[PDB]
Design a protein around this ligand. Sequence first.
Ligand code: HEM
Ligand code: 4MI
Ligand code: CL
Length: 393
Amino acid sequence: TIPHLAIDPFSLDFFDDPYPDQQTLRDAGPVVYLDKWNVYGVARYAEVHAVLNDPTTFCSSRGVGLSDFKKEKPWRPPSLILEADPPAHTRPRAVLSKVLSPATMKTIRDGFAAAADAKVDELLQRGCIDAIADLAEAYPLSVFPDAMGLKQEGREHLLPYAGLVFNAFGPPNELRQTAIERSAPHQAYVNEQCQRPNLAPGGFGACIHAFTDTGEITPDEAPLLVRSLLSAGLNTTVNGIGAAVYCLARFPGELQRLRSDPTLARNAFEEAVRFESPVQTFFRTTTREVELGGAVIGEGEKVLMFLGSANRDPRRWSDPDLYDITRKTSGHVGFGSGVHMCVGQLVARLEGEVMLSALARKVAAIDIDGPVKRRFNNTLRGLESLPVKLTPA
Ligand code: HEM
Ligand SMILES: CSc1ccc(C(=O)O)cc1
Ligand SMILES: [Cl-]
């Protein structure tokens, strides 16, 4: 009853161009079985949305990667938020919500925006730049570690550590196994910066530790919640901003609309998140036998959600393969949906908005002028190198 496919969604060929195989996965049926990894797959918007919004049946505490924590030991202590179910999830989630809340966004917005404007002014002096290293990476590195409260020394560990985290959600392929082989120094640095004395006053990390006396979290939970932000909040934004720049470079008509109304910056970024989906795939594990899209899934089965595919499903979106900065993007699953929906989404949107605003006001054209190189990761989509010429407005 369930179609069985041999598509490997963690293969280099799939990463290089996932869109045809994602259509094959959607069109095969609402629920597929992936024989390569012995998991169920859902690639349509409807089933991805349903799975995300039934956390009792499709749990996270057995891992959101391929590995089932009931069968294998996790590669690092489980996240207290991502890898927890209600009720254990609820209070750590509330703490991170308040740490990354509107009031916090108000305190950091002016500095984030000034840093975005400054970076674009600097890039315009060079003209020809790499929109990954020099923009998508450089900008978040200039604001997020400081907003966390991290010291200057050792920040070179942050991107490798986060890359490791996202490779580790994948199956035990060469990408995952090489990442884990190289992890020790990055884990050591990251774990150390999570301790209270190492986080500067007023930053996100200090705020997490300050919440350890309200009865929501205890002091011993705070380091792992700082670890969550370092794991989840840097390389995702890098790829989101890189995706937005790539879209503007490939769809010049939309750059022109954005220049004509810079208030479209926030939605231009949201549309880039839908269109490229930096976080491509995530898993759940069934806690009972369940009927989903007409199929019967047994207990203890891994279910792979194709977030990027759901964000391009023509059953849900008109012209899903077009980048449209005025699209009604509400409901896309690029940040998830339901109780785990990205707790850092306001930080991501602030960074993307102020960078796209700076581009909208300062740049007249973005022209690819060199070889584009993709970066391969088991669950993140994004580029390694994006040579562009920026023409000033
Ligand atoms: C464009 C940038 C980002 C994207 C595409 C993204 C994507 C996602 C997605 C899809 C989830 C849901 C995971 C699931 O349902 O299992 C999530 C959760 C989460 N995100 Fe983000 N994220 C981004 C930025 C950030 C930032 C900036 C932070 C922190 C500053 C952050 C921290 C987290 C955390 C801690 C969770 C777990 C929330 C929970 O389990 O309740 N993310 N993110
Ligand atoms: C959705 S990506 C991500 C989210 C949370 C964590 C974490 O809690 O460590 C890591 C990655
Ligand atoms: Cl770790």
